[PDB]
Design a protein around this ligand. Structure first.
Ligand SMILES: *C(=N)[C@H](C[C@H]1CC(C)(C)NC1=O)NC(=O)[C@@H]1[C@@H]2CC[C@@H](CC2(F)F)N1C(=O)[C@@H](CC1CCC1)NC(=O)C(F)(F)F
Ligand SMILES: *C(=N)[C@H](C[C@H]1CC(C)(C)NC1=O)NC(=O)[C@@H]1[C@@H]2CC[C@@H](CC2(F)F)N1C(=O)[C@@H](CC1CCC1)NC(=O)C(F)(F)F
Ligand SMILES: [Cl-]
Lengths: 303, 302
């Protein structure tokens, strides 16, 4: 038993991480097959950069790419949105089975924080409703990646590009499209007002009941419309029928209907915790998806 | 900036995990060079779990009784030895993925990364602290035993924990990689209980320093304290004593923030007296004790 914030095993991604140096800027790149993916702001020397014009002036030899103590030869460069693609002479022999996916707000992934192309640590993040992540990133962290594992397949969903003034983080998918209304430029930008990921809070309350924490359960049920009136008032994301459907398994297992669990959450929002905890937390946690709870409580493995 | 419960990258440990089967019992083993380390209770039967004579059970075992699997490859056991509560299975093939490694016995308050495994395959990685009562707050299901706790210094894996048991309060106990249990626990089904747990005071102070480095000062105050006056208050909230060693260890974080250790001790004293009053620190409504001074410096300073 027990319940922890659990990251995916990072080994398949560790063997893809390289160092990319251009001018004075060093950051990380992702080496898959014969291409290194990294943030395009590596070329910058910043208020209003013309990325296409700056890239035309670059040659292949301007990009120093190192896999450990081995220099890779760049034989081509191209920009895809906010991501630079450096074609190299060698295919990565450690390339895992992979694909590029775009995640939706409320989805979780594992971040492999890297410095100088060397993996430093791994942690679990949720894409916030305001399209930021609450990461942990120092100088040289950019090009660190976020992923999920399904069977033997790494799904890359995030590359790290920037920190906003409130100390939260923003980046792109591996096709270089920003999550949220951000640009890779030194100009005034702010994270929007954030909201709580309601479906994830319910999943975590189900996790609490599976681990024998039940003091918040009650006799009452609510309706989706009445719950959503309360959700709106407390800066919670609307609960949809899709969310109710996805919580179906945990509803069946615990014998607590989703709208019955919604009646518990409604009371917690109105009345607070009353000095009590849930799974060692004095607040409602929203960075576990229904699937995160099932895979941790079932012991799904990755080979 | 930012502050997260951060594990070490698990790849160097993933390449060491194997499956070990004896009879109907399957658990995990750690394959380093030509030795597989696993919990000795793999040799136990359901009849004899209250009072197993491990020496007597092991002499009865043949090498072919031990089914060891690395992916889709059976390893041949050519020798076995028991060191304390750990079984060392000598195999014919050395692990080509063996990293640079050390075995270290850690002290209470020390943190490490757990690679939770089933059937020799990794499920996930998370951070744990060795609690003052010599338990860890893990996440472990049937077949999790032989999962290891580790830290990585540069390219070198320090193995500090092997998972052996769950206590009736749902917390976890295990051994170092020489097979010595942390705490008074034994690998037997006989009634055992964790002692009363206490909060790792030096770790709470490290975390308050992390909060200041991340630009939060709301909990600070104008007061100082003596070490003995701090300890008399902390004890009443079931906090571990703060020693001069702990004050010395917090020296670097004190230098960076310009907050004297005994000044930060006065802030924690007030937080214990008042609570947080609808505020959070680093996204938490409680005082977090599972970050060491060392964890804070590597995450906040590089
Ligand atoms: C990648 N290495 C860095 C981000 C890391 C470094 C640190 C410590 C600030 N936190 C990180 O996550 N990426 C950047 O620094 C990016 C690049 C280069 C400069 C600028 C624009 C960019 F996207 F091209 N940038 C930022 O992160 C700036 C963005 C400003 C928009 C309003 C903030 N961030 C900052 O300057 C700061 F200090 F607010 F975080
Ligand atoms: C390793 N696979 C398991 C422990 C995992 C399985 C689960 C779900 C209980 N949680 C885990 O972390 N190890 C054991 O089961 C050990 C072995 C075999 C039986 C017994 C003694 C042992 F150490 F040799 N054991 C236990 O974990 C028992 C210990 C009892 C003494 C007081 C409890 N635990 C339990 O029976 C229980 F239910 F409390 F967790
Ligand atoms: Cl230690």
């Amino acid at each position: 038993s027990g319940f922890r914030k659990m990251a995916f095993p990072s080994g398949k991604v560790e063997g893809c991480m390289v160092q990319v140096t251009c001018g004075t800027t060093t950051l990380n790149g992702l080496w898959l097959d014969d291409v290194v993916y990294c943030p395009r702001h590596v070329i910058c020397t910043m208020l209003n950069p013309n990325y296409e014009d700056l890239l035309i002036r670059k040659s292949n030899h301007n990009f120093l790419v190192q896999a450990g103590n081995v220099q890779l030869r760049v034989i081509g460069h191209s920009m895809q949105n906010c991501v630079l693609k450096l074609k190299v002479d060698t295919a990565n022999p450690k390339t895992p089975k992979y694909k590029f996916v775009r995640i939706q707000p409320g989805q979780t992934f594992s971040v492999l924080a890297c410095y100088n192309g060397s993996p430093s640590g791994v942690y679990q993040c949720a894409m916030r409703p305001n399209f930021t992540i609450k990461g942990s990133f120092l100088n040289g962290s950019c090009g660190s990646v976020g992923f999920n594992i399904d069977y033997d397949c790494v799904s890359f969903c995030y590359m790290h590009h920037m920190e906003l003034p409130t100390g939260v983080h923003a980046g792109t998918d591996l096709e270089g499209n920003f999550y949220g209304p951000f640009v890779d430029r030194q100009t005034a930008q702010a994270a929007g007002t954030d909201t709580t990921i309601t479906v994830n809070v319910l999943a975590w309350l189900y996790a609490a009941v599976i681990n024998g924490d039940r003091w918040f359960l009650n006799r009452f049920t609510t309706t989706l419309n009445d719950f959503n009136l309360v959700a709106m008032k407390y800066n919670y994301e609307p609960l949809t029928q899709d969310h109710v459907d996805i919580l179906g398994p945990l509803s069946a297992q615990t014998g607590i209907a989703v709208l019955d669990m919604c009646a518990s959450l409604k009371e917690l929002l109105q009345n607070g915790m009353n000095g009590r905890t849930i799974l060692g937390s004095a607040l409602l946690e929203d960075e576990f998806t229904p699937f995160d709870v099932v895979r941790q409580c079932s012991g799904v493995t990755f080979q």
